[PDB]
Amino acid sequence: TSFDRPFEAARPDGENPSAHETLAEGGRLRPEATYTIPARQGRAIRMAQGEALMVINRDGSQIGDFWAFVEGDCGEYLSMEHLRPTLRRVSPRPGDVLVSNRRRPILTLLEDSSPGVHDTLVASCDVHRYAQLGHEGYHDNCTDNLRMALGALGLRPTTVPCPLNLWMNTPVVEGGAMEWRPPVSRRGDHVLFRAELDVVVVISCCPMDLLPINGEEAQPRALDVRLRPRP
Amino acid sequence: TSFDRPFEAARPDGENPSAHETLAEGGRLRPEATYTIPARQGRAIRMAQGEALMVINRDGSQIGDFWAFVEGDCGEYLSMEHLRPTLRRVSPRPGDVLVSNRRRPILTLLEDSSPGVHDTLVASCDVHRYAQLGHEGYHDNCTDNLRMALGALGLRPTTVPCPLNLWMNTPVVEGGAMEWRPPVSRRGDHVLFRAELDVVVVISCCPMDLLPINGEEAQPRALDVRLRPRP
Ligand SMILES: [Cl-]
Ligand SMILES: [Cl-]
Ligand SMILES: [Mg+2]
Ligand SMILES: [Mg+2]
Ligand SMILES: [Zn+2]
Ligand SMILES: [Zn+2]
Incomplete structure (x- = not known):
């Protein structure tokens, strides 16, 4: 979009399968089952208050861009x-x-x-x-x-x-200064988040592949997720 | 507003004279004249591309919260x-x-x-x-x-x-960790910004007065501004 036109937070600048594929209906994952967010793509995941979400660095060096929105209000x-x-x-x-x-x-x-x-x-x-x-x-x-x-x-x-x-x-x-360095994660490293409200989480498997760090560009790979029910 | 209601970026949670007083009509300052943004308040300032704005720490220890928006599009x-x-x-x-x-x-x-x-x-x-x-x-x-x-x-x-x-x-x-410290500015210290687009600048003279740093709360004071024309 030309910069004479206003910025639009919701408007994609292009397309990939993230526009049409969801991990599960409504982003409501089956508990304790592993799902894969494809390389270069994003997916949304609904969580009820008290549920937990594992995000797993499937191949070990991948950056995951992570957001969370309140259910019913993307303004929070x-x-x-x-x-x-x-x-x-x-x-x-x-x-x-x-x-x-x-x-x-x-x-x-x-x-x-x-x-x-x-x-x-x-x-x-x-x-x-x-x-x-x-x-x-x-x-x-x-x-x-x-x-x-x-x-x-x-x-x-x-x-x-x-x-x-x-x-x-x-x-x-x-x-x-900010100094670029390679990740210090390893294959299988995870983070675990608990939802304190009903939320919509979004994770993007970053497709950055043009920035050489320590002699090598990143090679975009997938990320795994797994939802744990509220006890 | 109750948190059952959506967040609204534009909705003030209360009032001070910032709701109704402007520095000049339309935020269009007279060039090379000093204006004062009162303590605890904010003001908007329009700038044409190539103009410059001085922001002056009038009393020397004041924090100024500073924003800029594209003219015609607060989404940028x-x-x-x-x-x-x-x-x-x-x-x-x-x-x-x-x-x-x-x-x-x-x-x-x-x-x-x-x-x-x-x-x-x-x-x-x-x-x-x-x-x-x-x-x-x-x-x-x-x-x-x-x-x-x-x-x-x-x-x-x-x-x-x-x-x-x-x-x-x-x-x-x-x-x-982030460590609170007193400002290192002095009375009369300034910053100067040049507008690279037509913009609306907003400056708030922060009213924080409840956080003791080095034994003393901040004491909100005013900030001065001065617009320089495009040569
Ligand atoms: Cl854009
Ligand atoms: Cl609020
Ligand atoms: Mg090479
Ligand atoms: Mg005291
Ligand atoms: Zn990215
Ligand atoms: Zn403030």
Whole structure:
């Protein structure tokens, strides 16, 4: 879309199967069954309050862009800029209550088998990022994956929140620069979240494949999820 | 508003003179004249592409919450989570082009007479923050100031972006904690921004007055602004 036209948080800039495939009807997963979010794509997952969701780094080096919205109101969402002052920390650890843009609990991070490195600072990739990196034509991207995954449940975001970039390792070094590093996750590492409200979670398997880190571009792969019922 | 009702980015939670007073008609300041944004309040300022805006820490210790929106489209705005990966830095320095949520230039930071400490990580204060700190009844807050200042020009935001928290000194220390510190600004310190598009800037003189740092609460004071014409 030409920049003379207004920005539209809900409008995808292109298409992939995220527009039409859902993990299960209504995003309501069967409990204790593993589902796979394909490489380069996003999916939405409904959770009832008290349920838990495992997100598993299936192949070990993949970044997962993670969002959560209140059921019935995409205008209230897990909010990185509210998360940080509430915890007085840049990124969450197991036991931390993660808040919405109303500063109320929306999720609790319960487990993290990795060394605990994640990024809360960086926007989701989008077509403008790929154009800036030299790419010709459409590139799959996390912002479009969010839009499509929500759209497949009949939902439209009114803003694109900052993702929680699961397993992304971009530390801030002395002097204020952000330094690209490879992930420190390993195959099978997981995080576990508990829903503190009824929510819609969205996860995008980031398709970034144009940024050499330590001599090699990322190679987009899938992520696994598994829902645990409320006891 | 009860949390059973949806979040509304444009709806103020209370009132102060920001709802009805503007610095000048339409936010169009007379060039090279100093205007004062009162303590605890916000104001909107229109800028044409190529104009510059000085923001002056009138009394020296005040935090200014700063936003910018594209003229004609509050859905496109100066975006902290896009600013950071574009600069590969946590906070901007003079010479840095600051981008919108479309990753295009919206402002350039031209000058900063302070030591250069600002925060891009923390949400604007809101009624929920003050309730969490123990406050009874309405408290002035930056999120409401944003809403009111835009409303006084006939504008309604569709999301509350993260502010740039001018002169806020909350460094991230080894281990990942954020540490409260007093500002390092001095009386008369300024920043200068150039508009790279026609924009609406909003500045809130943060009314935070309940958080003791180094034994003393902040004491909200005013901020000064001055517009420079396009040469
Ligand atoms: Cl766009
Ligand atoms: Cl609210
Ligand atoms: Mg190679
Ligand atoms: Mg005292
Ligand atoms: Zn991505
Ligand atoms: Zn404030």
